[PDB]
């Protein structure tokens, strides 16, 4: 954890707090703010481990409280006393975070009012939820009880929040000049939430775009495992069928250097090319480069795919608990590991078409241990009646396919791809 005796640089606070000592520790800062929880403030490394909990927060002077959720509240939304503002803050954080994290991390660009305003809606102390086993994130003065984000309805204080001041990381210039170096999507409309949004965006850029640590693991919070297994199932299905239908002599597999053949029994000449996940801008196809056979780009984000490609590309616009808002239109996809992904661009696919759903199988029609569909490509459907085994497998594959799509992945293929060509493999 971050030692409370660590020095805190106070130059960013001195316009809101004139006269503040240059020599300052976290210990003295927390005291001046009026306050298993050794420090309210955390290290960059702890913050990165808890990116799902990040909420940018800015206060502008009555005071306008702005959050990276887009919300502005005025404490005296129009101005209201702190005793009702705090209730809204609890509800807002609880609904934003209950399916993401066991805590909140306020990401600051600290100039003073934000820190001195915390005592009006934060309480600290040593706890678990009164109604479950999750750690407590809220407190209620009405009942003198504690709750997690799931059981906090009607609570009035944030309990043991964490926080980090981006201005401690060693920047020159103000927030907007640093944020705008990397991102054109978030403006500065001069409301507190705009600053809150830029602050979080800059932190995401510093910690996941220019710096990358794929060794950090993140807890399971949703359908991660089913999604990942579906992606492997779809990858095998689509590539196997492409090879059967068009009989490419060579396949160029471009992407993760730890990739394995997804169709190990295919006859094709399989050649690998190493490219790590690009976290900043999509790769330029000119630099990466292939006109023989087919190219496979499985989550290898390029600016324009060649016409002879099979592509899986994550759609950064998808709304889900796994996909967090990112930098310059990118998104931070957190599924076991954290992957910042450049903004989705439909123009990357101009040479391709959307891959249609289909299910293909050459396995024997046998049930161990009634489906009608034009897209069940099997011997039994060719012959007029889908067998029970392929019926079961088709419905499982459909489920997997829909899971992958709903998670944000999109699939694209060379324009000549035609499932009609699979029927003659039977
Ligand atoms: C009541 C009331 C108040 N409204 C504001 C407006 N906020 C800003 O102009 C701003 C500047 C930078 N970021 N936001 C401050 S106090
Ligand atoms: Zn609970
Ligand atoms: Zn931004
Ligand atoms: Zn069958």
From Swiss-Prot:
Reaction equations catalysed? a 5'-end (5'-triphosphoguanosine)-ribonucleoside in mRNA + S-adenosyl-L-methionine = a 5'-end (N(7)-methyl 5'-triphosphoguanosine)-ribonucleoside in mRNA + S-adenosyl-L-homocysteine
Binding locations of Zn(2+) 16: 365, 380, 387, 390
Q: Cite the binding residues for Zn(2+) 14.
A: 129, 132, 148, 151
Domain of life per record: Viruses
Q: Which residues bind Mg(2+) 2?
A: 60, 190, 195
Domain ExoN: from-to ranges: 40-209
Task: State the activity regulation.
Answer: Inhibited by Remdesivir antiviral drug (GS-5734).
**Where along the chain is S-adenosyl-L-methionine bound?**
253-259
List, from the UniProt record, the residues annotated as the active site of this protein: 58, 60, 114, 190, 195
Q: Where is this region: GpppA-binding?
A: 327-341
Q: What does this protein do?
A: Plays a role in viral RNA synthesis through two distinct activities. The N7-guanine methyltransferase activity plays a role in the formation of the cap structure GpppA-RNA. The proofreading exoribonuclease reduces the sensitivity of the virus to RNA mutagens during replication. This activity acts on both ssRNA and dsRNA in a 3'-5' direction.
Instruction: State whether it acts alone or in a complex, and with which partners, per the record.
Output: Interacts (via N-terminus) with DDX1. Interacts with nsp10.
The protein, known as: Guanine-N7 methyltransferase nsp14
Range within the parent protein: 5951 to 6448 of 7096
């Amino acid at each position: 954890h971050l030692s409370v005796d660590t020095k805190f640089k106070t130059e960013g606070l001195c316009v809101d707090i004139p006269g503040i000592p240059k020599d300052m520790t976290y210990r003295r800062l927390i005291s001046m703010m009026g306050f298993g929880y050794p420090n309210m403030f955390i290290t960059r490394e702890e913050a990165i481990r808890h990116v799902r909990a990040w909420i940018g927060f800015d206060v502008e002077g009555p005071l306008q409280l702005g959050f990276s959720t887009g919300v502005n509240l005025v404490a005296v939304y129009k101005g209201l006393p702190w005793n009702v503002v705090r209730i809204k803050i609890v509800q807002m954080l609880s609904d934003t975070l209950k399916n993401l994290s066991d805590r909140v991390v306020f990401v600051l660009w600290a100039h003073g009012f934000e820190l001195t305003s915390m005592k009006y809606f934060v309480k600290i102390g040593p706890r678990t939820c009164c109604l479950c086993d999750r750690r407590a994130t809220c407190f209620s003065t009405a009942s003198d009880t504690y709750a997690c984000w799931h059981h906090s309805i009607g609570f009035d204080y944030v309990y043991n929040p964490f926080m980090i001041d981006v201005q401690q990381w060693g920047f020159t210039g103000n927030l907007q000049s640093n944020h705008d170096l990397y991102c054109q999507v978030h403006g500065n409309a001069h409301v507190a939430s705009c600053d809150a949004i830029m602050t979080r965006c800059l932190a995401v850029h510093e910690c996941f775009v220019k710096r990358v640590d794929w060794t950090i693991e993140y807890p399971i919070i949703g359908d991660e495992l089913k999604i990942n297994a579906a992606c492997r199932k779809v990858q095998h299905m689509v590539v196997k069928a492409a090879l059967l239908a068009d009989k490419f002599p060579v396949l160029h597999d471009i992407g993760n250097p730890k990739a394995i053949k997804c169709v190990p029994q295919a006859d094709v000449e399989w050649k690998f090319y190493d490219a790590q996940p690009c976290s900043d801008k999509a790769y330029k196809i000119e630099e990466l480069f292939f006109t023989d056979g087919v190219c496979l780009f499985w989550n290898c984000n390029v600016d324009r795919y060649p016409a002879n490609s099979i592509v899986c590309r994550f759609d950064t616009r998808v709304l889900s608990n796994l996909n967090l808002p990112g930098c310059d239109g990118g998104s931070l996809y957190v599924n076991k590991h954290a992957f910042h992904t450049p903004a989705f661009d439909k123009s990357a696919f101009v040479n391709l078409k959307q891959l249609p759903f289909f299910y293909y199988s050459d396995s024997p029609c046998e049930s161990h241990g009634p489906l009608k569909s034009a897209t069940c490509i099997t011997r039994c459907n060719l012959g007029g009646a889908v067998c029970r085994h392929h019926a079961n497998e088709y419905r499982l594959y459909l489920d997997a396919y829909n899971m992958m799509i709903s998670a944000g992945f999109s699939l694209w293929v060379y324009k000549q791809f035609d499932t009609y060509n699979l029927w003659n493999t039977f």
